[PDB]
Design a protein around this ligand. Structure first.
Ligand code: CU
Ligand code: CU
Ligand code: CU
Ligand code: CU
Ligand code: CU
Ligand code: CU
Ligand code: ZN
Ligand code: ZN
Ligand code: ZN
Ligand code: ZN
Ligand code: ZN
Ligand code: ZN
Lengths: 335, 335, 335
């Protein structure tokens, strides 16, 4: 049983990167040890200075992605420093019992706890905070991320053939509910607690003020664009802990997609747009064949371009005229 | 043909239970006879006394689940007593022709009708009222339920192996559109007809005031929690006749899920959250492995916790530390 | 390579028809040449005279469906006449690179351009306009349609058996965001440009004023109902370039459905309601077995009946009492 196995300790890395790991492995099961520390902080979430009284695992939206293999045990130490105001906990969708671990990880400021569970199902799974009586607030304020449980022999196509990625990225998409005052301007709160009531009223409308990748409008653009090269297969992990989304790569595809995120199921191929149910993480593979700056976005184009749910992927390599060619550049219409 | 076969008569039971039935059967096709009686009534739908001018099959939201086997004929007598104000009918998504039967079951108050159709496709299917010119109102006011057509040889996994459940529950999720007056308080109407215009205006906003399981906030909690035991496989049938939802079991999984609800298709496994398209019923199996009180909810957590789309499942049995263990209880952070 | 192959020229036809084409073909790859001309125009979109400052490919919402076979090259000439006010382009979800072709087809009024790309994946794919900085506006104002890339050997069921349709229809579903003035009446704009700011404010609410098939409430009803006969298999192509939808045939099924729209994946069978992710096109086959007027609709019934997302299919042939029979017509309840 779990008390017999070797332990490993993993150092997490900040999104959109994912900590180094193997896909197919000859390793046997391990107890894999992680630690996360909660940070409440005010964050600027758009280009005009709007702030969110935010709550995070490890300082980031999303929290870092934790990667283990099927049959491993996840052993998380969750730290709630005294510098925080609220209690927190963690609910792993990949875990069985005790409301995902929530019932066993209730940490007031100044406390920590350690949870172990068996990661017995392969897939990308949401984890999120879920304190009794204030679950949606802690989720929408930023407290979610992904646990990826890889099959021990790596990813497989519908015919059981091997699949792999060369590079992985993790995108958390956050529907935010920022209140406005009578002047129509977004409210700025001195403390987390003061934002609560007004935010619940906005939540209940079901209309986000902003929908952002990785914590801010344009998080994944400019200097912070994702990167790849022609010939590389990228895994795009997409989590939405509260609300549906519909990822899409402009000028690309989901070559192999697990939209419900569970790797024991066959993936679908050649997707234009896939669907991440609120409360889940999904996974897409794409092998770049053309260089250029791509957009990766939620294809409700209002959600993407107006509300913030879009990033960029800058891809190096050589252009392929067989795949696409400008035959006649824009030029006057003929007489 | 159908005029040759034996008839059976089934007595329906109220949600969340489902009438006794076999899964795999050695029985041949039958004409299976059901009756439902429509009841219009005012219902209290939340903890603060809000009322809905509701419309129901058999007095309940959802209507009872009807269970037959593929190749059976469903023979429904639909009774509209004179104590009701409106005309009604029934549209079975499992039926072929005549707008699901709607065109053939138009019953004014004081009338009844009898419809037969062949249940030639396996699956969970929505049925709902659909009177010409007032379809959405009758649906959102409570007039829907599920027909479950089981394959004759029972449920199968993607490899054709047998699946089964030990206990079945039926959950209908209702997006409600209750109007408010100028004081911001929900309106209470003396009659069904008086609620119509105001309700259509709320409907057109696409924002529900409440989203409830089985007719009321907290319907499936406390004394009315669903129940199971460690080692039991439960089937959770989930219908949403008007609007999408995303079911999830906190601390569990969808072990095998037909999210589109059609059993001739292979199920997906190991789901964290699945998706019920508005206008459909889906089905999930889960074998409990840990005792405790679970939540079963729509994982738009605002919809669940603010608006009402959540229930509880209380599960007896022994805790399994291999699956999950508290390694260190919440305790002060060390120096 | 592509410079070697034969060229063909296709004449497009207006929705809901689809230009003649073969399914399974013994033909080898071709460069298939199409032309589309953009028309900006004011259109009446409902029964009370509401107008949309609309943008279209070829004068229609949706644009025409383009049909090729896997391994063909699509060669589109896109014409933006001088009679238009805005620049436009095209983003084909079926194409690889250059933001779907958008970067290579930027045409100001009075200009045209010609794009070739390899249609290397089978499926129904959205194409839409995507001018830098005004993508959602051009999409929601009507600038989308479908490219259908058929497998060279035709459609296949999950076991590799042949499937086919006898008749194809193309339905584009449009979430519209028409502004109102202080009097609560929809605004009418003298020019396209004047509609922009007010429309963006409505877009940002995420609540459509109207949701229509093929450009107008009731587009596909009355004289313009779709038609079929008992024994015919119809393909229903359903595109939604911006927002999710949930198609359903009342009194029918999706016999075989590719809801994500990609034919190399196995279809699901016996669907009651399927799901088209915003930003995608899907495809359903249904073989009619009963005559009558069907409804084909988005099964958010508010979206369908209140907001406009419904059409009719009028089906000729003989009634089948084995499939459905009125056993007792509506009649008084007995003493
Ligand atoms: Cu928290
Ligand atoms: Cu959860
Ligand atoms: Cu009714
Ligand atoms: Cu229906
Ligand atoms: Cu345009
Ligand atoms: Cu697109
Ligand atoms: Zn140990
Ligand atoms: Zn590779
Ligand atoms: Zn008989
Ligand atoms: Zn059992
Ligand atoms: Zn040539
Ligand atoms: Zn045919």
């Amino acid at each position: 049983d779990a008390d017999k196995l070797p332990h490993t300790k993993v150092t997490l890395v900040a999104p959109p990167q994912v900590h180094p790991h193997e896909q197919a492995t000859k390793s046997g099961p391990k107890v894999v040890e992680f630690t996360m520390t909660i940070e409440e902080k005010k964050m600027v979430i758009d280009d005009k200075g709007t702030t969110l009284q935010a709550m995070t695992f490890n300082g980031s939206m999303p929290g870092p992605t934790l990667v283990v293999h099927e049959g491993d045990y996840v052993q998380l130490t969750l730290v709630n420093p005294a510098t925080n105001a609220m209690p927190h906990n963690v609910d792993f969708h990949g875990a069985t019992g005790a409301l995902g671990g929530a019932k066993l990880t209730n940490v007031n400021p100044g406390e920590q706890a350690t949870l172990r569970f068996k990661a017995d199902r392969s897939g990308t799974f949401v984890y999120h905070c879920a304190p009794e009586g204030m679950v949606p607030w802690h989720v929408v304020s930023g407290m979610s991320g992904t646990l990826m449980v890889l099959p021990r022999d790596g990813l497989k196509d519908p015919q059981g053939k091997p699949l792999h990625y060369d590079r992985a990225y993790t995108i958390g998409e956050f529907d935010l509910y920022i209140p406005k005052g009578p002047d129509g301007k977004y409210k700025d709160y001195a403390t987390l607690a003061e934002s609560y009531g007004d935010t619940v009223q906005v939540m209940r409308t079901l209309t986000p003020s902003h929908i952002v990748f990785n914590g801010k409008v344009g998080a994944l653009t400019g200097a912070n664009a994702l990167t790849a090269k022609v010939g590389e297969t990228v895994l795009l992990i997409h989590s939405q802990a509260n609300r549906d989304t519909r990822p899409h790569l402009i000028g690309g595809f989901g070559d192999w997609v697990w939209e419900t995120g569970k790797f024991a199921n066959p993936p679908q191929r050649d997707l234009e747009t896939w669907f991440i149910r609120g409360g889940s993480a999904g996974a897409a593979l794409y092998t770049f064949k053309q260089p250029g700056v791509y957009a990766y976005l939620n294809h409700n184009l209002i959600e993407a371009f107006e509300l913030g749910a879009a990033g960029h992927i800058k891809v190096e390599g050589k252009w392929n005229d067989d795949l696409m060619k400008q035959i006649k550049a824009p030029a006057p219409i003929p007489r």
